[PDB]
Enzyme design. Structure first.
Site, mmCIF file in Angstrom:
data_model
loop_
_atom_site.group_PDB
_atom_site.id
_atom_site.type_symbol
_atom_site.label_atom_id
_atom_site.label_comp_id
_atom_site.label_asym_id
_atom_site.label_seq_id
_atom_site.Cartn_x
_atom_site.Cartn_y
_atom_site.Cartn_z
ATOM 1 N N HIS A 163 -29.100 69.731 96.058
ATOM 2 C CA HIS A 163 -29.304 70.798 97.031
ATOM 3 C C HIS A 163 -27.972 71.155 97.672
ATOM 4 C CE1 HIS A 163 -33.191 68.652 96.926
ATOM 5 N NE2 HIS A 163 -33.745 69.823 97.186
ATOM 6 N N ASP B 68 -27.199 68.742 100.298
ATOM 7 C CA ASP B 68 -26.811 67.394 99.887
ATOM 8 C C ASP B 68 -25.298 67.266 99.787
ATOM 9 O OD1 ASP B 68 -29.502 66.748 99.604
ATOM 10 O OD2 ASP B 68 -29.492 67.251 97.467
ATOM 11 N N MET C 244 -28.140 71.501 86.918
ATOM 12 C CA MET C 244 -29.126 72.165 87.753
ATOM 13 C C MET C 244 -28.702 72.053 89.208
ATOM 14 S SD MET C 244 -31.809 71.466 90.024
ATOM 15 C CE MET C 244 -32.786 70.004 89.677
ATOM 16 N N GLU D 297 -40.674 75.060 90.943
ATOM 17 C CA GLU D 297 -41.240 73.719 90.946
ATOM 18 C C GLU D 297 -42.507 73.725 91.786
ATOM 19 O OE1 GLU D 297 -38.597 70.662 92.089
ATOM 20 O OE2 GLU D 297 -40.157 69.120 92.171
ATOM 21 N N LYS E 175 -45.952 72.290 93.750
ATOM 22 C CA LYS E 175 -46.458 71.110 94.440
ATOM 23 C C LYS E 175 -47.697 71.567 95.187
ATOM 24 C CE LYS E 175 -45.081 67.178 97.330
ATOM 25 N NZ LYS E 175 -44.221 66.731 98.462
ATOM 26 N N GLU F 27 -43.177 68.588 87.923
ATOM 27 C CA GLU F 27 -42.891 67.209 88.300
ATOM 28 C C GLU F 27 -44.127 66.360 88.048
ATOM 29 O OE1 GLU F 27 -40.790 66.262 91.989
ATOM 30 O OE2 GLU F 27 -42.290 64.727 92.422
ATOM 31 N N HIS G 240 -46.417 65.621 91.044
ATOM 32 C CA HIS G 240 -47.014 66.739 91.769
ATOM 33 C C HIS G 240 -48.299 67.211 91.107
ATOM 34 C CE1 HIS G 240 -42.935 67.893 93.806
ATOM 35 N NE2 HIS G 240 -43.353 66.676 94.107
ATOM 36 N N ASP H 285 -39.039 67.364 86.056
ATOM 37 C CA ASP H 285 -38.795 66.283 87.006
ATOM 38 C C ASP H 285 -39.651 65.096 86.600
ATOM 39 O OD1 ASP H 285 -36.989 67.710 88.545
ATOM 40 O OD2 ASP H 285 -38.205 67.645 90.376
ATOM 41 N N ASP I 259 -46.926 62.140 98.112
ATOM 42 C CA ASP I 259 -45.969 62.214 97.001
ATOM 43 C C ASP I 259 -45.105 60.952 96.989
ATOM 44 O OD1 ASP I 259 -44.455 63.524 94.850
ATOM 45 O OD2 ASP I 259 -43.041 64.251 96.361
ATOM 46 N N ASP J 218 -43.081 59.600 94.404
ATOM 47 C CA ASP J 218 -41.779 59.685 93.741
ATOM 48 C C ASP J 218 -41.317 58.308 93.256
ATOM 49 O OD1 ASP J 218 -41.784 62.409 94.187
ATOM 50 O OD2 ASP J 218 -40.227 62.359 95.738
ATOM 51 N N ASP K 210 -36.576 62.822 89.566
ATOM 52 C CA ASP K 210 -36.730 63.120 90.982
ATOM 53 C C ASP K 210 -37.553 61.963 91.546
ATOM 54 O OD1 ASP K 210 -36.961 64.150 93.477
ATOM 55 O OD2 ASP K 210 -38.032 65.976 92.907
HETATM 56 MG MG LIG Z 1 -39.130 67.479 92.258
HETATM 57 MG MG LIG Z 2 -42.395 64.505 94.405
#
Ligand SMILES: [Mg+2]
Ligand SMILES: [Mg+2]
Ligand SMILES: [Mg+2]
Ligand SMILES: [Mg+2]
Ligand SMILES: [Mg+2]
Ligand SMILES: [Mg+2]
Ligand SMILES: [Mg+2]
Ligand SMILES: [Mg+2]
Lengths: 386, 386, 386, 386
Positions: free
Chosen positions: A53, A56, A87, A180, A182, A216, A219, A244, A254, A256, A286
């Protein structure tokens, strides 16, 4: 023993191994990582590249001077390691200004700000060589029914993506967008909640060829959906631009988890599909190393992501190459599924008395599909019992 | 007191009030209903019309002679009552021959049989005046990963729908198709599991203008999705051809409760949306009177479907007409959501320093959205406390 | 190669391999099996024994004469094969009279009938040598809130189980009861929906030592719960009298997949727990061969149940015996979890300044738990990569 | 118009209206509230009292001097407003030291620290007049199977609660404990995940009479369970010591919506049950004003909690007082459910030929339960259509 190399195209977000462990109920358990040390450590593990991002890499509110210094440090680490940046994406969810969304915020001035923040990072992504630009609309949604007219919000979402597409084409950039999905969290319901909703929305954009999906694992599983099935539909539509990879234990927040955790059999069928279909994009993780872990556990968790993909890749390849499995696929008529139902055409079908008037419905019904024997061969291959 | 009339366009499937109560663990608790008595009883309740599967009206295996007699009896009851038949569909799920699907069965001869069975009923539907033909692919799916190559299955699904579209256009029929999604049950995972997946699939058909969706309240809720949000996306795409109304208590087996049961607030927001958007199709109830009920309970349950729609219609209309609610909608900036983000265009946006360089991000972030006051006014209206 | 023998104590319900494939949307795809041929075929596969509902063995409505002939045929097949009958249960869900429940039906005469039907089968179970009598209250519940006063229903449920306990003690029978929880289906909500609710209810019975739980993998997963965690609590309470093994893919209808399908990692941790804790009861499979299968697929599916248990048993044993795993368990302080928090007592704890006043909270917080390395060793062992 | 007074016993946690809006993906949107201003604002809204975690009132790490000053300020605000403090609890989840739990952390020294932190706050709670002490074990759990031996963890959990019970009895405190279950979040799975698991665990403690449950609407709904059913079982066991009221839209992250939002019909049946059963404890709201809201929205959201309870209380009372509903309850045989199945005893039941030999099973099966008419009367009352 299942060692990754940059040729395997494994990539990680800076925000993944960099997650400090702050969750809705607890403070951070790990100190912040310098993006430069993350690039170095991932390169030693065999990773191909990193993603980011904007926020980030460049702390929010940075002056143009500090911005230039942050990019130069990052670029030097990429040069030193050979790491790529395939990406990039925009943070349109952390700052309080985005509390009701970015592209679909009710306030018009926030929507304009969100577009300008995105366009600035597209320029940087192109400079770093990214080929895909991901949009995760984490704040686009609502907790209550009257807060958001969804038809108006979809108009605003289409307007935003159309403008981004006009921007990249007018600049001559060779970059594509990936949405993406979710279904929820942090909003009560998020717009475009699954792969399907995102694929349908793309077909209404002015330049649909510029847009695909970035699904993802966790998700789609938050809606109880079959992730390999959703990936197959995205591949069928030609829209799987990025993916992802992670793990999720059912319908809940979520998680992850590292890839391979969560639904292990779905991970097997996913790898089987990606490898059979010849998906050539990045294998992006991710994931969040659990906040129980210190920094040694962070790198063990990241290494486990790549290891589990390579083990599953080996098992899926042995499954498809096994002559007994090829025999079982024919016994279950997977070969017949791939053949046209009526290549002879509609009129021949209507005149074909063996398709209806003289079709033996009881004899066809008595045929077993032999699916359970096939699925146990798949289990045997996954577990290394073959 | 909330009395339905045929002008309200309430319709019921023959299979709804006709459900005998056989579930996976128990025998039927009610005797079979003659389709003619169902039409008569529904007409007395104020219903506008009925819908049917081919096998609801004509018992499977009937000779052409018995088939003609079943249709004539049915047509006479429609004439006697003034009831309409706005929609019809095919049973491609009950007979054992369909155990691995109809359009996407692995066996090619089953797929051809499924198409011929469908085409025969399209002719009958047109003769009875149906305007929409629904396809619910309840057996199209899998319990295990290797049983179904989903890309091949989507090819077969597209082939089947393209052939049906070629058939209706070559015959000059004025009928449109509506795909009804469901995420699971009776298959472990069903293809095209949500409204979004179905909308995306339609865009790949040869004549997409012939196809829309028939969403069902309970089916989207079986994936934990927001049903009014999904309906809004279908309306936004111009694809809401038909709708199935019922109730569902969360993520579990398909309950098919009477409309208004299950998620009551979602039912309110659904009715608000359908009435505001001017949806003019049938208000169709796909519900099952619980097997605890005798025949008096069946008709009470059906009456409750229509009553609850009319009560919610009244409450949603009072909500939208309330000047204090109109004030609250502006306080939450719903008016600004409906205005273009950048009608001035991309270049003006890029040159607009108030959109980024001079945007006061802290002042925008401090603005409350006032969503909770708006949602409590909606609650007050639903409960009759205003 | 992972061959079962009767010493492995694998058992199957007659209703499992005997399921004809009738689901809520479809007719049976397989003919009925004679209970005698099921016993013979299971014995050849290596099964230890079978279980039955009264109505599986003796068709409902049978005269005492036909009843005697059905038992004698069954007993002869047990003698011929060496198969045991470790568990029996009552069908209080199929017949329409049970549509609102058996023990908690609103009608008092139905509740009395349910008790008499149960007591008759307890006598038969004892005669056949069953040690556990299972009660699955599949119809005890409600679809709507006012239909069932749950406090009164729990009174009726306690009354029924207390009477059964009085009956077995007065007859001197050496049999114990096991309650099988399920959260929903076929009722909208079922009473005692999880292992926990059933364990709590047992503690209110007059003779709690006679009652335990019969948990089923898929049923706890229908509430999104961790099945090995629930089994551990049942073992901790000394109440795991029996267990139903199968597979389930998340929160949806009760799939009853063969064991090892569904959540594979949960199956691994379950087997690890049962084997480590020394569970010595039957390994019972409550599963349904999918209705896609012919009879060859039925026996392949049943064989797969036992095979997957034996593979997972081998992998869990290798995991626990691996010195590197034993090292990792100590690194994660599993040894410290097993040691008392305060064997020194309350007063010593209150006087211990190292427990609070002088406790270094920052140094303790910095310790990583090393859980991810431990979990990847478990993954490696499951996949045969160690 | 539905105005609360302190006699309605509505209470709020300091952490509820004080939630700053930090979620896993975003920074705080509201400034911190002084506990003294929260007490004042809640008193003006009609609240009866407040609850607190130790760390809500006394910032972590405070010296004994600052601690005394924080309590004195708080006590003065209680004196000025007449607000009570009926419940207190411990924060054993925010600080990094608790990342693997408090009472069941693998590290023994953390477990001892957790007990000392709890005991210190029990003293303060007693001084402020709290009657119930709540324990929410939010960090007691695991993300992976090998990280936590659940039998050892339950030993540690029992040890901790037994020590707390020894402490309060030795001090002569008149306080009782209430365990608050949650199935997941922030841990992947949390120990004692539902009301049932907590009730079963309590029966294994040394002094079970000191312990009850503090169920939360949204937490049981995160497992898809029927919250009024779970409350009824807690009341049946005599263990409902406290309750957390809020709203939740299905199986997803813990939303903590204002009470009345989420599942509206479940809220109606909950209020009906609490009022009918004569629950006399606090009506406590554990909710989070959405982070879209400014401080005006916070107080509107809190006011809505109490308003919705009072509206539902009125509707449930009208439902139970309606003679037509009382007639319908008898038609559905709710009166028969409350009568003993076999007060005549086991031997009379065994000799009663009308209970089996001469029971007309077909006539009993044909009786409709009339549940749908009853449920529509409940709907009419909820919506104010009666
Ligand atoms: Mg993701
Ligand atoms: Mg996630
Ligand atoms: Mg349905
Ligand atoms: Mg439907
Ligand atoms: Mg089951
Ligand atoms: Mg079972
Ligand atoms: Mg909560
Ligand atoms: Mg709470």
């Amino acid at each position: 023993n299942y060692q990754p190399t940059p040729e395997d195209r494994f990539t990680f977000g800076l925000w993944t191994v960099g997650w400090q462990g702050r969750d809705p109920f607890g403070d951070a358990t790990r100190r912040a990582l310098d993006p430069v040390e993350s690039v170095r450590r991932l390169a030693e593990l065999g990773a191909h590249g990193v993603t980011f991002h904007d926020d980030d890499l460049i702390p929010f509110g940075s002056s143009d001077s500090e911005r230039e210094e942050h990019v130069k440090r990052f670029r030097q680490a990429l040069d030193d390691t050979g790491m790529k940046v395939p990406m990039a994406t925009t943070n349109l969810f952390t700052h309080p200004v985005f509390k009701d969304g970015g592209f679909t915020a009710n306030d018009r001035d926030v929507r304009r700000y969100a577009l300008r923040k995105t366009i600035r990072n597209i320029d940087l992504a192109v400079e770093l060589g990214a080929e895909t630009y991901v949009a995760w609309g984490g704040r686009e949604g609502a907790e209550s029914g009257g807060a958001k007219d969804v038809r108006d919000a979809l108009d605003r979402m289409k307007e935003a993506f159309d403008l981004l597409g006009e921007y990249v084409t007018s600049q001559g950039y060779d970059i594509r967008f990936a949405i993406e999905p979710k279904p929820n969290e942090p909003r009560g319901d998020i717009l475009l909640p699954t792969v399907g909703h995102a694929l349908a929305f793309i077909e209404r954009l002015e330049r649909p060829e510029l847009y695909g999906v970035n699904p993802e694992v966790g998700h789609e599983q938050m809606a109880g959906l079959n992730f390999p099935h959703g990936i197959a539909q995205a591949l069928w539509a030609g829209k799987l631009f990025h993916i992802d990879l992670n793990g999720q234990n059912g319908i809940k927040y979520d998680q992850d988890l590292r890839f391979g955790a969560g639904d292990l059999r779905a991970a097997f069928w996913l790898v089987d599909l990606l490898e059979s279909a010849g998906y050539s994009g990045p294998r992006h993780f991710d994931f969040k190393p659990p906040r129980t872990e210190d920094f040694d556990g962070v790198w063990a968790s990241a290494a486990g992501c790549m290891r589990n993909y390579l083990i599953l890749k080996e098992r899926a390849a042995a499954f498809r190459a096994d002559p007994e499995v090829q025999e079982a696929l024919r016994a279950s008529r997977l070969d017949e599924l791939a053949r046209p139902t009526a290549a002879d055409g509609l009129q021949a079908l209507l005149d074909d008395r063996s398709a209806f008037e003289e079709f033996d419905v009881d004899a066809a019904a008595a045929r077993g599909m032999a699916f359970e024997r096939l699925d146990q061969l798949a289990m045997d291959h996954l577990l290394g019992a073959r």
